[PDB]
Symmetry: C3
């Protein structure tokens, strides 16, 4: 079946992802990447306090990153290497804004410990005349590894669970990332231990496998949007906001 019928509305389907007071669309189905099974709820294990999450409020879609994709970028050059708990907060905090100001962060302010699966969209608007390729990959503990520069390479992450994005026919990388840390919970700020590496479950990272191969005088620049949903969460550990921690640098 192939009859093209673009009316006053150029025809084509648009799948949407609402899902909680925010609707974000994608005109092209994503290339998913599921690195692990869905995480069970270990609140009834580690902590016996206010055991809950926040539905309509922390299970939304906030923006955490956005960047540029150009012909200048050589073969393996990561556009982002963003930590995943974590840079949800660390993006907003360095936006000359506070964590307290946004609805998808506020319990991190009050509550001490967090556990939950993650959802991520790597949406880009590239043109059909751009011949490039990216790869969004996940690593459940990047900073803990010593020589991960060895792994920090397009070759290395192809070896593992990832998603693929090609400039033409742009395209989205779905990226379901459930919770798998060593300890079942994460600490939102400084704690009797975890005096650093606060709220870090691993980093995402997008490098390049094919530069934007542009014709003579073709459009140079491109762009990426990183979105994140925090579903299936649990926030036990009620603590005043003066105990909080404005996350570390990029």
């Amino acid at each position: 079946m192939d009859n093209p019928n673009p009316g006053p509305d150029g025809e084509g389907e648009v799948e949407l992802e609402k899902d909680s007071n925010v609707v974000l669309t994608t005109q092209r189905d994503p290339s998913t990447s599921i690195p692990a099974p869905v995480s069970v709820k270990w609140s009834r294990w580690t902590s016996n306090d206010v055991v809950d999450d926040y539905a309509t409020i922390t299970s939304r879609w906030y923006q955490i990153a956005e960047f540029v994709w150009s012909k200048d970028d050589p073969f393996d050059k990561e556009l982002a290497r963003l930590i995943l708990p974590r840079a949800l907060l660390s993006s907003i905090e360095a936006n000359s804004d506070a964590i307290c100001d946004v609805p998808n962060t506020i319990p991190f302010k009050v509550h001490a410990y967090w556990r939950g699966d993650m959802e991520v969209r790597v949406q880009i608007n590239s043109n059909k005349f751009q011949v490039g390729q990216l790869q969004a990959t996940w690593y459940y503990s990047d900073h803990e590894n010593l020589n991960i520069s060895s792994k920090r390479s397009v070759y290395g992450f192809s070896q593992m669970d990832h998603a693929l994005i090609s400039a033409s026919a742009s395209n989205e990388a779905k990226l379901v990332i459930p919770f798998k840390h060593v300890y079942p919970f994460l600490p939102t700020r400084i704690v009797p231990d975890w005096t650093t590496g606060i709220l870090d479950m691993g980093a995402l990272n997008i490098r390049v496998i094919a530069p934007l191969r542009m014709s003579a005088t073709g459009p140079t620049t491109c762009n990426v949007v990183v979105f994140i949903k925090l579903n299936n969460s649990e926030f036990t550990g009620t603590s005043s906001g003066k105990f909080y921690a404005s996350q570390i640098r990029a």
Copy 2:
């Protein structure tokens, strides 16, 4: 389903509209605009004489207009403001041709009064690299309104029944226009009343909502075809042709 298979014949469907000794096609389904219900037959009311229409002859598709669409045309600039009974005749008469010469007009020559629904095609051949938009709109009595210049605007006709045409993915505006005048019949020429505004049931009018937005050195010009079918008619009122009226100017 999306497998593209363009053989020696580039594949794609072509819907056709024959319908009476003329076949006109459209490779893209139209955006219809039905302003009113189908009109009932009031011949057995106003006049008791030869009560009939003409099938294969006046229910065809003649051309009445054609024009240019260019980047120069600013935002709201009507390409045509053509009266609808009316300019079926008024186009041919000013073509240095006579009404008598064409089969889709001849009963208007002889017969005194006419009633009937109308069918109209606003077909254009624009290219997929042209980013513009038109709007064909109908008004069951334009000349009767005094300040209709107020209405003569892209904003105003969007308020009402219309069709939309965008340059890219060109595209057709189906435009079924049934009979709705004040008096159930129309006079083909001067009459004991209707000494002017002869044969006028309202005017069609195509303005611009988006100019042809062309890249550097992209194709400048475009073009429109206006076709018209006169179905569901009735022509009671037999009169010699020396009583006829060559319609007024553009």
Copy 3:
């Protein structure tokens, strides 16, 4: 149905033709051309000796020709006029290679007489911005006709069984050519008769019906691939290879 969904893999089906240790694909269904019924097996008629063919070995897909398609080529200019038994061997022999070296020829070396249907692919990689047209046509005995230059024309072969190839939406010409000679068998080399015209069942020939109509500075050159399958064969007539014949010139 027309929803376009080109993921990291630009979506679209790819039909394949394996068929015997070689897989060749075509992303666009072919325009077939069947000039005759399937040939019956006349081995149990002409010759009472080792009656067999060779499956996995001579029923493969070898390349016999490839050439250039450019704007310079005027209206009717044959890109190839290749004989069909025949140039399967005659291409390889003039490749500074021997017949003995390739698996799809070796029985022709040993065996004296051959009969069999033929399969041919005229695959080309033209771009969607090239507006040309070719025509691959078959003639069960071209050399036998005296004034076939009269027939050697785009007009003439359109009169008969052929396939059509247009530059844009490139495209393949399937070309099933069963055996129909005067005598039911063909001689692989010189023989008590057939002292010339060795192994010739007719010639294929691709001319032009529409040159590559290229925009300013659009891509000039193009290209064709000719493939051939020799199925439904029969090779009776065992003879030493010193009796063989390296085919005549192009």
